[PDB]
Write a protein that binds this ligand. Sequence first.
Ligand SMILES: *[C@@H]1O[C@H](CO)[C@@H](O[C@@H]2O[C@H](CO)[C@@H](O[C@@H]3O[C@H](CO[C@H]4O[C@H](CO)[C@@H](O)[C@H](O[C@H]5O[C@H](CO)[C@@H](O)[C@H](O)[C@@H]5O[C@H]5O[C@H](CO)[C@@H](O)[C@H](O)[C@@H]5O)[C@@H]4O)[C@@H](O)[C@H](O)[C@@H]3O)[C@H](O)[C@H]2NC(C)=O)[C@H](O)[C@H]1NC(C)=O
Ligand SMILES: O=C(/C=C/c1ccc(OC(F)(F)F)cc1)N1CC[C@@H]2CN(C(=O)c3ccc4[nH]nnc4c3)C[C@@H]2CC1
Ligand SMILES: [Ca+2]
Ligand SMILES: [Ca+2]
Ligand SMILES: [Cl-]
Ligand SMILES: [Cl-]
Ligand SMILES: [Zn+2]
Length: 804
Amino acid sequence: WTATSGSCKGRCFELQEVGPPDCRCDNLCKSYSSCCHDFDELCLKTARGWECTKDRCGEVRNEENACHCSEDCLSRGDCCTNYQVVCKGESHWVDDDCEEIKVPECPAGFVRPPLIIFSVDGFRASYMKKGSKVMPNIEKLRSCGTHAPYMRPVYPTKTFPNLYTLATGLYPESHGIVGNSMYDPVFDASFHLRGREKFNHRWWGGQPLWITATKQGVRAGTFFWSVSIPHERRILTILQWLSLPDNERPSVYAFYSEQPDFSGHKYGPFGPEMTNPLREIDKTVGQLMDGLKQLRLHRCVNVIFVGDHGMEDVTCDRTEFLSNYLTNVDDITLVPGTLGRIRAKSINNSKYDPKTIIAALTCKKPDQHFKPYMKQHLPKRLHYANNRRIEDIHLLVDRRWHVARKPLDVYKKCFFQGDHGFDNKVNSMQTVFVGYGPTFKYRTKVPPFENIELYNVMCDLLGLKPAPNNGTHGSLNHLLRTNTFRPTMPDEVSRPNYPGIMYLQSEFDLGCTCDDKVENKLEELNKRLHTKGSTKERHLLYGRPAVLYRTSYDILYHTDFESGYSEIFLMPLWTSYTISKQAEVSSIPEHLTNCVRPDVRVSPGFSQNCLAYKNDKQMSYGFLFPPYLSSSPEAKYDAFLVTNMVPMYPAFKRVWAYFQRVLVKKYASERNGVNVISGPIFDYNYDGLRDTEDEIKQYVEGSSIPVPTHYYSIITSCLDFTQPADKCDGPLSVSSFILPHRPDNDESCNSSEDESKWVEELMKMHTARVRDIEHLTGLDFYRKTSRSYSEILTLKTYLHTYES
Ligand SMILES: *[C@@H]1O[C@H](CO)[C@@H](O[C@@H]2O[C@H](CO)[C@@H](O[C@@H]3O[C@H](CO[C@H]4O[C@H](CO)[C@@H](O)[C@H](O[C@H]5O[C@H](CO)[C@@H](O)[C@H](O)[C@@H]5O[C@H]5O[C@H](CO)[C@@H](O)[C@H](O)[C@@H]5O)[C@@H]4O)[C@@H](O)[C@H](O)[C@@H]3O)[C@H](O)[C@H]2NC(C)=O)[C@H](O)[C@H]1NC(C)=O
Ligand SMILES: O=C(/C=C/c1ccc(OC(F)(F)F)cc1)N1CC[C@@H]2CN(C(=O)c3ccc4[nH]nnc4c3)C[C@@H]2CC1
Ligand SMILES: [Ca+2]
Ligand SMILES: [Ca+2]
Ligand SMILES: [Cl-]
Ligand SMILES: [Cl-]
Ligand SMILES: [Zn+2]
């Protein structure tokens, strides 16, 4: 029940929310069906349209018009946005040359430059170029303001997850909105676009911008708009608010457009029918910019033009059906579309085995347009596992395709030519960012960045302290003219030990043997220098990584590589080495094939043993620094130290060996040398953060040797490739991956072929930001360079995507 007997008289679009049973007059009243009887009459006026005409100039004020052209309209703050052009001979904002806004030019009583978020749904990145001819206002913002070529959304590239990430700086796994449709097993409730469940606050975690603003005494206009409120009324309402008295006027505003998404689904991303919605958005932007110019605010307000995701060509006939794969199709629930999520149909079924489901969906058709994953096995860059609303089984769907359960679901539940939701590295899914105003830079192009970073920036633009989020604060300082946040390196928590030679061979009982007895004052003093770290400025090019948690570890120096060896985890946390362009690949000589040597710097008690690997029939081992890249036959013996060794499934060894033997050399040739840092990751609880010692779920049988869930490498070189990696004077270039450490190669359908047909493709899929590895290891890289910290944070958030 709601007693909607009150009035909206003088309450049109009120900023405080009144409670039951009194009727409401805010921009959300409709969605709650709680509006006052006269809401439409008083607040949603349409009479005479949205533009002033020549005859209307200096008219008498009729209060039933949608906007006014009367003399007192500027005072009342409700002129039609084109009033000054038609009636006062002023120019449109678009027709003015753009002049740099060096200082905020704000009216009196304005404590800070206001922020207006102009969000556009499904606004694919490539529209900025391909529609430029029909979007003159947007093109002005772009060329005069600060813009990226594109901005990367979060996965899934859906509306609700992405709009709420924009508002929170959080991954969906963290804010809780993991899809447009969700089932929470603890609530036993479903979230849908249609229905009232989506309104309960229990679905929405994190702290969105408008809550952050309020808690810190910065007033917010209501972000969300009802579908039946025309865009013109949305602009006027925002311009009205900007006319409110100082003590009432919000500092942050949001506008939202359901276009071009709406048309995109119908007509595809580039349908000839797409020109008009693009024309319209631009006109809406023109109205805001003209309106701001009236209020003398067009050189005071910061405007963000931002999209949630792009749009892909998708049709009914491009649907994969699970019924073509499974026998028991009725014992599963599927969340369908541009992504698949599978769970049991009955919540407590004993004989439900996701293993057989996965197996039934794996490389079963030569042409398969999706791939099944256990969620912990999804690429770590997606950050899509750590929420109870994310089903254990996931299907990553090929761009342009859909997955459905049965054919009846598609024909009894084609009308559409467009859709979105795919892997967030997909080109068609990229969306837009433009910043314009006093605080943004002037005519500045920035590199592409991820939408998780904007919350920090919007907090900065408003003088707010951001809630804890997934952005890297300071990585987008280069978008801004004036920065309110100076980022600083975190302090190292653990300092390393620097052990010398302390143990004799016979003290070790590791079950390891090596044929190393085959054997001068000059070259014996030379190799001592190597163990002292004489060649360390060659193999450790950016300083030692800092350990940001409490642990016990040793720095080990060698001729060819340096390592941070953990006495807790019995293996290195990191291994650092430089491979120059000139460097050569050799093989493991025949006598050294099974060679594992004790490390006389490290105690038997803090070492791995070979016996455990002998007994554990599932688990073999590999080496972090590759024997194949030793600089001399004598230095190769270093690669076989027990302290360079890590547990590896034979299946994974195929991937790793190809990386170490072939790919590193290829990268060094293409990039003019590379520095490589490699190591283990332990994330058994799939939360994207390093596991503590007491959270390890797997050991090499009958040992205390923990098995990594993943192996990473960070591969750095000079951005100016005319310079070698180890003598770089400028900006850096980086690519990284986090490989899942899996007992099989079921992910790569071509794995029975030679490693050259599949391994690199798998690595590309598991591309990663340096920052992802940091979360997962508790380490902090690039501590010693000649580059500014902001530039280094930008470098750390970089993702090499491999898209063309
Ligand atoms: C991305 O950035 C976020 C934010 O910094 C990081 O997430 C934080 O991680 C830490 C460490 O694991 C968590 O702290 C622990 O949690 C609890 C306290 O938790 C409560 O209090 C906070 C503070 O107000 C609140 O945000 C939490 O809200 C969670 O739970 C709600 C339901 O109960 C839910 O509506 C909401 O979405 C959120 O759920 C998410 O986090 C929980 C874990 O807390 C997780 O189970 C779930 O799947 C969701 O992902 C909650 O009421 C303490 O008792 C512990 O001691 C410990 O300190 C933070 O809670 C957590 N913050 C948020 C907002 O999630 C991510 O780690 C980071 N990711 C990466 C990859 O870097
Ligand atoms: O009013 C807002 C935004 C406020 C905002 C504005 C800015 C913003 O960013 C921030 F926070 F940073 F300012 C966040 C939210 N709405 C957006 C949310 C939903 C989306 N929706 C759909 O029907 C819909 C659209 C596309 C689809 N494709 N497939 N299914 C789809 C379903 C109904 C509702 C409209 C209201
Ligand atoms: Ca959307
Ligand atoms: Ca973890
Ligand atoms: Cl294999
Ligand atoms: Cl630990
Ligand atoms: Zn959509």
